[PDB]
């Protein structure tokens, strides 16, 4: 018998916290329709009254509308869903006072889940933005058509960044291997004014092409060892964990 | 007569541990619906009442609802399913006290089967990870295009591991036989940062290719015998056993 507690504004609206091993007090007065609301996305499977004539039942998804229709309507409603089963003991009140207009359920486990996700998301964003413990390489040299040149190039050990001025078109940047073969490398455009192209690799030689002009960028302090990617993300302060399980 | 054992929160919720050589004493009161829950995945076969008219029966999947529809409705319920057959002694309660809102079953054998398997899986993972008493071979040489070379290479007598630095593209590794022909060998990519390629064979010579570059790896301590695989797994402490029988 989980007798619930009322709201702070109207005693007609009364909240109860679900418990799989206890039943719920509902006091129904004559002429009022009580609303029992399910958790969002929950699918109604089967319901069962004690006296199916005593109470009137209407359902629209997760909104269940109930109503008395006979004297001494003291029965129970057991509505079962895919997730849980609800347990009521409907006792009619004689003097038409202390009605309930809707019942609300509080789910400790769902709240504990969804509150964790928001905090974790805020922490993750803070961790990405913190961006500490980084070493920068600035020993980059270029030779070729200096009219497509970046104003600055550097790498942080994981990505390589090319910074372009505001009046310069953004060119294509290619991956040059040992034999001089160019090949595609994925790039993301970062920066406030989209002036930086971040390629997702550290390499000793790069090739910059725009139209019919070519520029060669050389990494003059190439570190073959690099720094390992133990976390699965672009930063060492955010782990990528396996959610799908399975 | 197994009497349903009442919970701690409410008397209306009573739990019973299944016993094939015993029955269920269900004390039903007038004007309620008793919700009997089967095990998940249990396929209802057939039921049989003492009186088809004394109690009202409606079933949905593994959900059972019954409801008395007559006075002195003392009959029996024998519902039989693919897994077992339940036994109830429906004894009407005359004063309408001490109701039984839902009957929940506990299966001892199923819980034992599920806990034995979980303990076995825990032991299996512990034995896989413990990796005790293995012998490592580090006499590996290389000659060729050193820019695609691993930073380390060894084997434990069953697999060969090539460790690559964080900035190096992971190349393709080919099995080389006596005449110099190459053939595919299966590989698994292991390591915290996915820096290790583990090939599933110990061989004297290997071939590493990436684009138009090639490197040859030479095992200078090839053991023609090795260690036999008596267990069926990659570990000497985890046996692979035949489940399917047949």
């Amino acid at each position: 018998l989980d007798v619930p507690s009322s709201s702070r504004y109207d005693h007609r609206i009364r909240y109860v916290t679900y418990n799989p091993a206890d039943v719920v007090q509902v006091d129904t007065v004559l002429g009022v329709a009580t609303h029992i609301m399910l958790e969002e996305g929950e699918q109604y499977l089967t319901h069962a009254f004690g006296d199916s004539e005593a109470y009137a039942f209407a359902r629209k998804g997760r909104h269940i509308f109930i109503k008395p229709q006979a004297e001494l309507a003291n029965t129970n409603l057991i509505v079962v869903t895919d997730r849980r089963s609800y347990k009521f003991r409907l006792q009619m009140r004689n003097d038409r006072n202390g009605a309930m207009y809707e019942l609300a359920f509080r789910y400790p486990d769902t709240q504990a889940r969804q509150t964790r996700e928001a905090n974790a998301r805020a922490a993750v964003e803070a961790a990405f933005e913190q961006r500490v413990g980084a070493y920068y390489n600035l020993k980059y040299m270029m030779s070729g058509d200096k009219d497509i040149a970046p104003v600055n190039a550097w790498d942080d050990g994981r990505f390589t960044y090319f910074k372009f001025s505001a009046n310069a078109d953004l060119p294509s940047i290619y991956f040059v291997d040992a034999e001089g073969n160019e090949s595609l490398v994925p790039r993301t455009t970062v920066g406030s004014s989209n002036n930086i192209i971040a390629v997702h690799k550290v390499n000793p030689k790069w090739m910059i092409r725009l139209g019919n002009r070519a520029l060669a960028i050389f990494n003059e302090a190439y570190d073959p060892n690099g720094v390992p990617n133990d976390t699965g993300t672009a930063s060492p302060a955010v782990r990528r964990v396996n959610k799908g399980g399975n | 007569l197994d009497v349903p054992s009442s919970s701690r929160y409410d008397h209306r919720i009573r739990y019973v541990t299944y016993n094939p050589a015993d029955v269920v004493q269900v004390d039903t009161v007038l004007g309620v619906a008793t919700h009997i829950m089967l095990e998940e995945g249990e396929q209802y076969l057939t039921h049989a009442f003492g009186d088809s008219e004394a109690y009202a029966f409606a079933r949905k999947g593994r959900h059972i609802f019954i409801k008395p529809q007559a006075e002195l409705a003392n009959t029996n319920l024998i519902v039989v399913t693919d897994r077992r057959s339940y036994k109830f002694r429906l004894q009407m309660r005359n004063d309408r006290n001490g109701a039984m809102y839902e009957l929940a079953f506990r299966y001892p054998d199923t819980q034992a089967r599920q806990t034995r398997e979980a303990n076995a899986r825990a032991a299996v993972e512990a034995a896989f990870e413990q990796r005790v008493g293995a012998y490592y071979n580090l006499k590996y040489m290389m000659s060729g295009d050193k820019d695609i070379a691993p930073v380390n290479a060894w084997d434990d007598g069953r697999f060969t591991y090539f460790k690559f630095s964080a900035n190096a593209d992971l190349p393709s590794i080919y099995f080389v036989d006596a005449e110099g022909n190459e053939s595919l060998v299966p590989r698994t990519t292991v390591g915290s940062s996915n820096n290790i390629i583990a090939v599933h064979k110990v061989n004297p010579k290997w071939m590493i290719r990436l684009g138009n570059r090639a490197l040859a790896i030479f095992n200078e301590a090839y053991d023609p015998n090795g260690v036999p695989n008596d267990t069926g797994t990659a570990s000497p402490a985890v046996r692979r056993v035949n489940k399917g029988g047949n």
Binding site: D51, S52, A54, A70, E71, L72, T75 | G31, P68, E71
Partner: peptide
């Protein structure tokens, strides 16, 4: 047929 009696009969009959 007191209200208790009618309540009991409705209780029994109802599905």
């Amino acid at each position: 047929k007191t209200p208790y009696e009618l309540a009991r009969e409705r209780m029994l009959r109802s599905g």
